[PDB]
Coordinates of C-alpha atoms in Angstrom, one line a residue:
Chain S
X9 CA -1.3 9.6 23.7
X10 CA -2.4 13.2 24.6
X11 CA -0.6 15.4 22.1
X12 CA 1.9 18.2 22.6
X13 CA 1.0 21.7 21.7
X14 CA 3.7 21.6 19.1
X15 CA 2.5 18.2 17.9
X16 CA -1.0 19.7 17.4
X17 CA 0.4 22.6 15.7
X18 CA 2.5 20.7 13.2
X19 CA -0.4 18.3 12.5
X20 CA -2.8 21.3 11.9
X21 CA -0.2 22.8 9.6
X22 CA 0.1 19.6 7.6
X23 CA -3.7 19.4 7.2
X24 CA -4.4 23.1 6.7
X25 CA -4.4 25.2 3.4
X26 CA -1.4 25.2 1.0
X27 CA -0.3 23.5 -2.4
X28 CA -2.0 20.2 -2.7
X29 CA 1.0 18.9 -4.6
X30 CA 3.5 19.9 -2.0
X31 CA 5.5 16.9 -0.9
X32 CA 5.5 16.7 2.9
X33 CA 7.3 13.4 3.5
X34 CA 9.3 10.9 1.4
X35 CA 10.6 7.5 2.3
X36 CA 13.6 7.1 1.6
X37 CA 13.9 11.0 1.3
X38 CA 16.0 12.9 -1.4
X39 CA 18.3 11.6 -3.0
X40 CA 16.9 8.1 -3.0
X41 CA 15.5 5.9 -5.9
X42 CA 11.7 6.3 -5.9
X43 CA 10.7 6.9 -3.2
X44 CA 7.2 6.8 -1.5
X45 CA 5.7 10.2 -1.2
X46 CA 3.0 11.9 0.6
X47 CA 1.7 15.3 -0.6
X48 CA -0.5 17.7 1.3
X49 CA -3.5 16.5 -0.8
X50 CA -2.8 12.9 0.3
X51 CA -2.1 13.7 4.0
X52 CA -5.5 15.7 4.0
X53 CA -7.3 12.4 3.5
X54 CA -6.4 12.0 7.2
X55 CA -8.8 14.8 8.2
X56 CA -11.5 13.5 10.2
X57 CA -14.5 12.1 8.2
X58 CA -12.3 11.8 5.1
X59 CA -11.5 8.5 3.4
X60 CA -7.7 7.6 3.3
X61 CA -6.2 7.1 -0.2
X62 CA -3.8 4.6 -1.4
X63 CA -0.8 6.9 -0.8
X64 CA -1.5 7.2 3.0
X65 CA -2.1 3.4 3.2
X66 CA 1.1 2.3 1.4
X67 CA 3.2 4.9 3.2
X68 CA 2.0 3.8 6.6
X69 CA 2.4 0.0 5.8
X70 CA 5.8 0.7 5.0
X71 CA 6.6 2.5 8.2
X72 CA 5.4 -0.8 9.9
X73 CA 8.1 -2.7 8.0
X74 CA 10.8 -0.3 9.3
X75 CA 9.5 -0.3 12.9
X76 CA 9.3 -4.1 13.0
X77 CA 12.9 -4.3 12.1
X78 CA 14.0 -1.6 14.6
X79 CA 12.1 -3.2 17.5
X80 CA 12.9 -7.0 17.1
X81 CA 9.2 -7.6 16.0
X82 CA 8.5 -10.3 13.3
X83 CA 9.9 -9.9 9.7
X84 CA 7.2 -8.1 7.9
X85 CA 6.5 -7.9 4.1
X86 CA 3.8 -5.6 2.9
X87 CA 2.4 -5.6 -0.6
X88 CA 1.3 -2.5 -2.4
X89 CA -2.4 -1.6 -2.3
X90 CA -2.2 -2.2 -6.2
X91 CA -1.0 -5.7 -5.8
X92 CA -4.2 -7.5 -5.2
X93 CA -6.5 -6.0 -7.9
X94 CA -3.7 -6.6 -10.4
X95 CA -3.3 -10.2 -9.3
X96 CA -7.2 -10.7 -9.3
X97 CA -7.5 -9.2 -12.8
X98 CA -4.3 -10.5 -14.4
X99 CA -2.9 -13.6 -12.7
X100 CA 0.4 -14.6 -11.3
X101 CA 2.5 -13.6 -14.3
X102 CA 1.3 -10.1 -14.0
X103 CA 2.7 -9.7 -10.4
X104 CA 5.6 -12.2 -10.3
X105 CA 8.2 -9.3 -10.5
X106 CA 6.6 -7.4 -7.7
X107 CA 8.7 -9.6 -5.3
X108 CA 12.1 -9.2 -7.2
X109 CA 15.0 -9.4 -4.8
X110 CA 12.9 -10.7 -1.9
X111 CA 12.4 -14.2 -0.6
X112 CA 8.9 -14.0 0.5
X113 CA 9.1 -17.3 2.4
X114 CA 11.9 -16.1 4.7
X115 CA 9.6 -13.4 6.2
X116 CA 7.1 -14.2 9.0
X117 CA 4.1 -12.1 8.4
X118 CA 2.7 -10.8 5.1
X119 CA 0.1 -8.0 4.9
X120 CA -2.0 -7.5 1.8
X121 CA -4.1 -4.4 2.0
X122 CA -7.3 -4.9 -0.1
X123 CA -9.3 -2.0 -1.7
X124 CA -12.9 -3.4 -2.4
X125 CA -15.6 -1.4 -4.1
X126 CA -15.7 1.4 -1.6
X127 CA -13.6 0.4 1.4
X128 CA -10.3 -1.0 2.7
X129 CA -9.7 -4.3 4.3
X130 CA -6.8 -6.4 5.1
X131 CA -5.4 -9.9 4.5
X132 CA -2.7 -11.1 7.0
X133 CA -0.7 -14.1 5.9
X134 CA 1.1 -15.6 8.8
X135 CA 3.9 -17.7 7.5
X136 CA 4.8 -19.0 11.0
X137 CA 1.5 -20.7 11.3
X138 CA 0.5 -21.2 7.7
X139 CA -2.6 -19.1 8.2
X140 CA -4.5 -16.4 6.2
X141 CA -7.0 -14.2 7.8
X142 CA -9.2 -11.5 6.3
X143 CA -9.9 -8.5 8.5
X144 CA -12.7 -6.2 7.4
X145 CA -14.2 -3.5 9.5
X146 CA -17.6 -3.8 7.7
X147 CA -17.7 -7.5 8.5
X148 CA -17.4 -8.8 4.9
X149 CA -16.1 -12.3 4.3
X150 CA -13.0 -12.7 2.1
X151 CA -12.6 -16.4 1.8
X152 CA -12.6 -15.7 -2.0
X153 CA -9.8 -13.1 -1.6
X154 CA -7.9 -15.6 0.6
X155 CA -8.0 -18.4 -1.8
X156 CA -6.8 -16.1 -4.6
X157 CA -3.9 -15.2 -2.2
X158 CA -3.1 -18.8 -1.3
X159 CA -2.9 -19.7 -5.0
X160 CA -0.5 -16.8 -5.5
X161 CA 1.7 -18.2 -2.7
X162 CA 1.9 -21.6 -4.4
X163 CA 2.7 -19.9 -7.7
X164 CA 5.4 -17.8 -6.0
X165 CA 6.9 -20.7 -4.3
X166 CA 7.0 -22.9 -7.5
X167 CA 8.5 -20.2 -9.6
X168 CA 11.0 -18.6 -7.1
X169 CA 12.0 -21.7 -5.1
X170 CA 11.1 -24.5 -7.5
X171 CA 9.2 -26.1 -4.6
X172 CA 5.5 -26.7 -4.1
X173 CA 3.3 -25.7 -1.2
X174 CA 1.0 -28.4 0.3
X175 CA -2.1 -26.1 0.4
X176 CA -3.8 -28.6 2.7
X177 CA -1.5 -27.5 5.7
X178 CA -2.8 -23.9 5.0
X179 CA -6.1 -22.6 6.4
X180 CA -8.4 -19.4 6.0
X181 CA -10.1 -17.5 8.8
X182 CA -12.6 -14.6 8.7
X183 CA -13.1 -12.9 12.0
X184 CA -16.0 -14.0 14.3
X185 CA -18.9 -11.5 14.7
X186 CA -17.5 -9.5 17.7
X187 CA -13.7 -9.4 16.8
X188 CA -13.9 -5.6 16.1
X189 CA -16.4 -4.5 13.3
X190 CA -17.6 -0.9 12.6
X191 CA -20.0 -0.5 9.4
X192 CA -21.3 2.8 10.7
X193 CA -18.0 4.2 9.0
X194 CA -16.2 2.9 5.9
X195 CA -14.6 6.5 6.2
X196 CA -12.6 4.8 9.0
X197 CA -12.1 1.6 7.0
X198 CA -8.6 2.7 6.0
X199 CA -7.8 3.6 9.6
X200 CA -9.0 0.2 10.8
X201 CA -7.0 -1.5 8.1
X202 CA -3.8 0.4 9.2
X203 CA -4.4 -0.2 12.9
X204 CA -5.3 -3.9 12.3
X205 CA -2.0 -4.1 10.4
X206 CA -0.1 -2.3 13.2
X207 CA -1.2 -4.7 16.0
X208 CA -1.1 -7.9 13.9
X209 CA 2.4 -7.1 12.8
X210 CA 3.4 -7.1 16.5
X211 CA 1.5 -10.1 17.7
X212 CA -0.5 -7.8 19.9
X213 CA -4.2 -8.5 20.6
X214 CA -6.5 -6.0 18.7
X215 CA -8.1 -4.1 21.6
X216 CA -8.7 -0.5 20.2
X217 CA -12.3 0.7 19.3
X218 CA -14.1 3.1 16.9
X219 CA -13.8 5.8 19.6
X220 CA -10.1 6.1 19.1
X221 CA -10.0 6.8 15.4
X222 CA -10.0 10.5 15.4
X223 CA -7.0 10.5 17.7
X224 CA -5.4 7.8 15.6
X225 CA -5.8 9.9 12.5
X226 CA -4.1 12.9 14.2
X227 CA -1.3 10.6 15.5
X228 CA -0.8 9.2 12.0
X229 CA -0.3 12.6 10.4
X230 CA 2.6 13.1 12.9
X231 CA 3.9 9.6 12.3
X232 CA 3.9 10.1 8.6
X233 CA 5.6 13.5 8.7
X234 CA 8.3 12.2 11.0
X235 CA 8.5 8.7 9.7
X236 CA 8.3 7.3 13.2
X237 CA 5.5 5.4 14.9
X238 CA 4.3 6.5 18.4
Chain W
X4 CA 20.9 5.0 -25.5
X5 CA 17.2 5.4 -25.9
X6 CA 15.2 2.7 -24.0
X7 CA 11.7 1.4 -25.0
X8 CA 9.2 1.2 -22.2
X9 CA 5.6 0.0 -22.2
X10 CA 3.0 1.7 -20.2
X11 CA 0.1 -0.6 -19.3
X12 CA -3.3 1.0 -18.2
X13 CA -5.9 -0.9 -16.2
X14 CA -8.3 -0.8 -19.2
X15 CA -5.8 -3.1 -21.0
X16 CA -4.2 -0.5 -23.3
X17 CA -0.5 -0.3 -23.9
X18 CA 1.3 2.9 -24.9
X19 CA 4.9 2.5 -26.0
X20 CA 7.7 5.0 -25.3
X21 CA 11.3 5.5 -26.5
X22 CA 13.2 7.7 -24.1
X23 CA 16.7 8.6 -22.8
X24 CA 17.9 6.5 -19.9
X25 CA 18.8 9.7 -18.0
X26 CA 15.8 11.9 -18.8
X27 CA 13.5 12.2 -15.9
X28 CA 10.4 10.0 -16.2
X29 CA 8.1 13.1 -15.8
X30 CA 8.4 13.8 -19.5
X31 CA 7.1 10.3 -20.0
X32 CA 4.3 10.7 -17.4
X33 CA 3.0 14.0 -18.7
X34 CA 2.8 12.8 -22.3
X35 CA 0.9 9.8 -21.1
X36 CA -1.8 11.8 -19.2
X37 CA -2.2 14.3 -22.0
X38 CA -2.6 11.6 -24.5
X39 CA -5.0 9.6 -22.4
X40 CA -7.0 12.6 -21.2
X41 CA -6.2 11.7 -17.6
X42 CA -5.6 13.8 -14.5
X43 CA -2.2 13.4 -13.0
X44 CA -3.4 13.5 -9.4
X45 CA -5.8 10.7 -10.0
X46 CA -3.3 8.2 -11.3
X47 CA -0.2 6.3 -10.1
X48 CA 2.7 5.0 -12.1
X49 CA 4.5 2.0 -10.7
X50 CA 7.4 -0.2 -11.7
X51 CA 6.9 -3.7 -10.4
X52 CA 4.6 -2.3 -7.7
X53 CA 7.0 0.5 -6.6
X54 CA 6.5 4.3 -6.9
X55 CA 8.1 6.1 -9.9
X56 CA 8.5 9.8 -9.2
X57 CA 8.5 12.7 -11.8
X58 CA 12.2 13.2 -10.7
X59 CA 13.2 9.6 -11.2
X60 CA 15.2 8.4 -14.2
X61 CA 15.1 5.0 -15.8
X62 CA 18.8 4.3 -15.0
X63 CA 18.1 5.4 -11.4
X64 CA 15.2 2.9 -11.2
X65 CA 17.3 0.4 -13.2
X66 CA 14.7 -0.2 -15.9
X67 CA 15.8 -2.2 -18.9
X68 CA 14.6 -1.7 -22.5
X69 CA 11.2 -3.4 -23.0
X70 CA 10.2 -3.0 -19.4
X71 CA 6.6 -2.4 -18.4
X72 CA 5.3 0.4 -16.3
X73 CA 1.7 0.2 -14.7
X74 CA -0.7 3.0 -14.3
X75 CA -3.3 2.6 -11.6
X76 CA -6.2 4.9 -10.7
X77 CA -6.1 6.3 -7.1
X78 CA -8.0 4.3 -4.5
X79 CA -10.2 6.3 -2.2
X80 CA -13.7 5.3 -0.9
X81 CA -15.5 8.5 -0.8
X82 CA -15.7 12.3 -0.9
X83 CA -16.3 14.3 2.2
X84 CA -17.9 17.7 1.4

């Protein structure tokens, strides 16, 4: 996508000077019960070379849920970026309510965004094929993260459905060496996580490269303002 | 109709609150940062994983008495200069 002059303009306005706390997009918008928000300060973490913060990540993951529904793409559940550290630190009981009113096992793909010491990565849980994969643009392994996530699934299933998983029919993958790393910039780690999640959620092979990130950051500022993926 | 709510920090601490079910949660949030010496912009309040906004009310988010709110620090890798 080469961008419109007006697109460019609105993107430059959203990233330029003004009140850091000014709310630029909310999903669902006023009046709705809370309510993801993006302020000017958060949307500035999309300036090139800046690291994305949790508010950008969660807002974008959520646009993927809406988009998947509108396009006939697979049923997508995305967890908060706060879900995994809370589960790692405090166990199933601490997060059991974070799926209230949802039957996780009637979805098809689950995305778990993972913030690690200094970078973003992603776990995809593919319910159709009983598979978990850890995608990390700095090439780290996450078979530990995955096993914690699989345990959570058995714990959800036993609690919410009173049934057990057979964890033997379930399998971990970490990517092979050339399935898209870039360790040169953990600045772009959050963009990789969001694009990984965008393609994975559509069953689309992951073919973009590092060269596209600056354009993807500008596109994502417009997507967030307009709550619509391009 | 006051409701008690628990606010749980990541350092394990727990600050209790009694508050009107139709008062905006911002009153709660500000008291919390001031008390903990925290910066509002650096922290997130969540109710079972979902955003609570200053403008939100407990009734509007259908909290019940005794419920727990989490506070998390922002997650950001780095600082560009």
